[PDB]
Every structure is written in structure tokens, then in C-alpha cells.
């Protein structure tokens, strides 16, 4: 499946 | 029917006994035959006290093919092919080449 | 089922068409009614689920004929 | 063993019938299972014999 950090929004969204 | 059959005396045509005569011991539905004193293989068999067997190497005869033997004519003294004729409602085998019923 | 016991009329599918000719499936289904019919020839009423026309046939051919049919054909009734 | 009893009488046969079971078959199982019966082929026939028994009798009466 996918690692938790990839699914998680705060770490992943990082630069909008 | 079958050309080479059970209690027959035959002469080998091919390979390692080529030319060795012998009597057919039995004939196996693989299309093979076991013939006495023709093919000898030294099997290694463990000695058994219960069966009172000495053990060590023993000599026996392996199954050769039916097509590797042909039955010995003994009137010509050579190998000979077999046919089937009818005599008095009996399907008998006969030697080819002198046409003699076996 | 919505089948006319006299004519065998049953619902048939066709289309709607708008002024822009948009096709939308639809059904035309028959003008059924179910009606107490006097036979006299059996001193009894029989309710046939019948179409108008089914009636107009019964008017013309006359009941008993129509009842020969149905029975000829096996219709319960 | 077939026509040997094609002609052996419907009533008479039901006798050997039992005699196959009544004796051979039951005694054989017991004796066998208990490690006696050295000649197993007796189990093959007997069973096959009863089959013959019942083939006639069925074909003699009614069929």
C-alpha cells in the first residue's frame, strides 16, 4: 500500500 | 495375437547378446520379455536374515524388447519371422521361410 | 398483466421525441378496463379485462364467439 | 459357475444365498480382520459369488 507520511496531509502538502 | 509368447525358445537379433539363444521366462505387457540367460544385470541386494538371503551382488535377467528377439527356427537354425494361418479353425503361428507350423 | 384478453393487446415500447427530437424511452399501454359482461347463453356475468376495441369487437363478433376463442386458446376466464 | 445354476430354483438359491453370507462372508470378515485369513482371495469371490446368485433369481423371477 502506501507509507503513512505520503497519505498524511500536513507533511505532504508542505508548499502551497 | 502375439508372435513371441511364453514358453518359447528364441534367438536374439540385437545388442550385447546378439546371437544368444534362450527360452522366454515371461512376457510383460509393456511389450517386453524376460528371457533366460540373455540379459544379465548385477543388482545389489541387501542381505536379509528373516528371508535367509545371503545378500551381496546377485545376477538376474532384465526385460529386453519383444522386437529385439525373434523365435529360433531350429530346422534352419536361424532367426525367423512368424505369421498366423488358420488350420481347422485354430489360428496357429507358423514360421515364415519353409512355412512350417510351430 | 396489462394484456387485453380479447385482442392480445399488450404494452409496446416506442419513443418520446422533444421539439429537439430527444429520444426518451416510453411505453404505450392499452386502454384496459375489466367489465362485467352478460352472456345469457350461460345465465351469468363474466368479467374480462378488456380493451376498448376489445369491447367494440365483442359488440360486433358478439360475446359467445369471442368466448369460443379464449377457451379455444385456453384463456382462464 | 453361471449356467450351473441358471436352473437351480428361485427358492433353492436363496439358500446358497444365505450360505454365501450366513457362512462364508461373515466368517471370512471376522476371521480375516482378526488376522487369521491367510488366503485373501476368498473375500473377492464369495462377494462375487453372491453377485452371481442375485443376478439369477432377479432375472429368473419377475425380470
Amino acid at each position: 500500500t502506501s507509507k503513512w507520511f505520503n497519505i498524511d496531509n500536513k507533511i505532504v502538502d508542505h508548499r502551497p | 495375437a502375439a508372435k513371441i509368447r511364453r514358453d518359447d525358445e528364441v534367438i536374439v537379433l540385437t545388442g550385447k547378446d546378439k546371437g544368444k539363444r534362450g527360452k522366454v521366462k515371461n512376457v510383460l505387457s509393456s511389450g517386453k520379455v524376460i528371457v533366460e540367460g540373455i540379459n544379465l544385470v548385477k543388482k545389489h541386494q541387501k542381505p536379509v536374515p528373516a528371508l535367509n538371503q545371503p545378500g551381496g551382488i546377485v545376477e538376474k535377467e532384465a526385460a529386453i524388447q519383444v522386437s529385439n528377439v525373434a523365435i529360433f527356427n531350429a530346422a534352419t537354425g536361424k532367426a525367423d519371422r512368424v505369421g498366423f494361418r488358420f488350420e481347422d479353425g485354430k489360428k496357429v503361428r507358423f514360421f515364415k521361410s519353409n512355412s512350417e507350423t510351430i | 398483466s396489462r394484456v387485453c384478453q380479447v385482442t392480445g393487446k399488450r404494452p409496446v415500447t416506442g419513443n418520446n421525441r422533444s421539439h429537439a427530437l430527444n429520444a426518451t424511452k416510453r411505453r404505450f399501454l392499452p386502454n384496459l378496463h375489466s367489465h362485467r359482461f352478460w352472456v345469457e347463453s350461460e345465465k351469468r356475468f363474466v368479467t374480462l379485462r378488456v380493451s376498448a376495441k376489445g369491447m367494440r369487437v365483442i359488440d360486433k363478433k358478439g360475446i359467445d364467439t369471442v368466448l369460443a376463442e379464449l377457451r379455444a386458446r385456453g384463456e382462464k376466464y | 459357475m453361471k449356467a450351473k445354476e441358471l436352473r437351480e430354483k428361485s427358492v433353492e438359491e436363496l439358500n446358497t444365498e444365505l450360505l454365501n453370507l450366513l457362512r462364508e462372508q461373515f466368517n471370512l470378515r471376522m476371521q480375516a480382520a482378526s488376522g487369521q485369513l491367510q488366503q485373501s482371495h476368498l473375500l473377492k469371490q464369495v462377494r462375487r459369488d453372491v453377485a452371481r446368485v442375485k443376478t439369477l433369481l432377479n432375472e429368473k423371477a419377475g425380470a
Binding site: - | - | - | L21, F26, R29
Partner: protein, 93 residues
Amino acid sequence: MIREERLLKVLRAPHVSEKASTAMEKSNTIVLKVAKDATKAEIKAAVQKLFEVEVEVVNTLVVKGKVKRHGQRIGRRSDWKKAYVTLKEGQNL
């Protein structure tokens, strides 16, 4: 009678096996593999007729086949019935 003589092929084998069998010999009763459809009463009869002994009462239980061996696929044994028969008194065999 009640059970045809034919159908007294319900007795299938003695279960002379384990002290369970023999230590429950030495204190009445004998035990046996017996049919599958056999009806306690039906198997008492067999033991009366054949074996010609007396029988107080018979208990039954079903043994379930052990499943075993094999690599991918698997093999199972047959189920079968146990006897435990309990003879009245002048006890013999």
C-alpha cells in the same frame, strides 16, 4: 423376527485394540467396529444370533476420520462406529 437375517452383516470387525479394549474386557463387555447405519438394538441382535452370547445393553459412538499427509492437496479417512457391548454373565466371547 424384527431384523432380517441378511442384514445381520452389521458386525464388521472386533476392535481388539488398546488396553481400552482389553482392560474393558476384564470387567465385562466387548467392542467392535460395526456398520455405520447400525441401530444398537440392531447390533445387539447380531451379537445374540451370531457369537451366541447374552448382552445386557449396547452403547455406540462415531469415530471421525483423521485427515492427513499430502503436499498441496489432502487425504482424509472414513468415519466408523464403535461398539462397547457388555455381556450379561456366563461370559465367554
